[PDB]
Ligand binder design. Structure first.
Ligand SMILES: [Ca+2]
Length: 223
C-alpha cells in the first residue's frame, strides 16, 4: 500500500497473509475454512496466516493453517489477468472471533464512487522499495468503467474494475496482490494488477468479485 495508513492490529479481521516461508500475497477469509485470493498468487505449499498484524513477530492472535487445496478459476488467463481469482481451502477450520472473522460476499456489484478499504503488506513506495511489517490500509473510491478503460486501453475486461486516484500517490502495490477491497462491509475486489504503483493515470485494477459469487458458493458447497 502506497500513500495509506497503519491499519492498527487486527482492525481488518478478514485480512490474511499467504505464506510460503515468507509473505507473498494477501487474501480474504470468507468462511471458517476458505480464503479467496488472486489466481496469479497461486503456488504450492501455502500456509494461511490469520490474525496477523506484524508478520515478522508473533503477537498472540495468529492462526497458522496450511492449505489443503487450491482452486484457480477455470477461466483464469495469466496473460491478460482475466478471471484473477482463486479459492484456498484450509486443512482445519479457523477459530472465528473478533480479530479473525470472515468478510461477506457481495449481493450486488458496487458502483463507481463508492469508498472502499484496501489493505495489505505490500510495498509502500512508488519509486523505491520498502515493505512494512504491519498491515497498511487505504481508503479509495471505485472509478468509473470508462475512466478505467481509458487509463488501460485494450486491457480492462468485464471482470475488472479500477479503484484509487488518477492523480497518483495512493494505491495498492506489489505484495498486496490477492488482498481485499471492501465496500459497505462486502468484498467487492481482489488486488490484481496495475502499471507500477501510485502513478498518475494508472490506478489499481481489481478482480470484480460480484461476478464470481455463484462460482464461489457452488465451489465451496462441493469441496
Ligand atoms: Ca504476527
Amino acid at each position: 500500500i502506497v500513500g495509506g495508513y497503519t491499519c492498527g492490529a487486527n482492525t481488518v479481521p478478514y485480512q490474511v497473509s499467504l505464506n510460503s516461508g515468507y509473505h507473498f500475497c494477501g487474501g480474504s477469509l470468507i468462511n471458517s475454512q476458505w480464503v479467496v485470493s488472486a489466481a496469479h498468487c497461486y503456488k504450492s505449499g501455502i500456509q494461511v496466516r490469520l490474525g496477523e498484524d506484524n508478520i515478522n513477530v508473533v503477537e498472540g492472535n495468529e492462526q497458522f493453517i496450511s492449505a489443503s487445496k487450491s482452486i484457480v478459476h477455470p477461466s483464469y488467463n495469466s496473460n491478460t489477468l482475466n478471471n484473477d481469482i482463486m479459492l484456498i481451502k484450509l486443512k482445519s477450520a479457523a477459530s472465528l472471533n473478533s480479530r479473525v472473522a470472515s468478510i461477506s460476499l457481495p449481493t450486488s456489484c458496487a458502483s463507481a464512487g463508492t469508498q472502499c478499504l484496501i489493505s495489505g503488506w505490500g510495498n509502500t513506495k512508488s519509486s523505491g522499495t520498502s515493505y512494512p511489517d504491519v498491515l497498511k490500509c487505504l481508503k479509495a473510491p471505485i472509478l468509473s468503467d470508462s475512466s478505467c478503460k481509458s487509463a488501460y486501453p485494450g486491457q480492462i475486461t468485464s471482470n475488472m474494475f479500477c479503484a484509487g486516484y488518477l492523480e497518483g500517490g495512493k494505491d495498492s502495490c506489489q505484495g498486496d496482490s490477492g488482498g481485499p477491497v471492501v465496500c459497505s462491509g462486502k468484498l467487492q475486489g481482489i488486488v490484481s494488477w496495475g502499471s507500477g504503483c501510485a502513478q498518475k493515470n494508472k490506478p489499481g485494477v481489481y478482480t470484480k468479485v460480484c461476478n464470481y459469487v455463484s462460482w464461489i458458493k457452488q465451489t465451496i458447497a462441493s469441496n
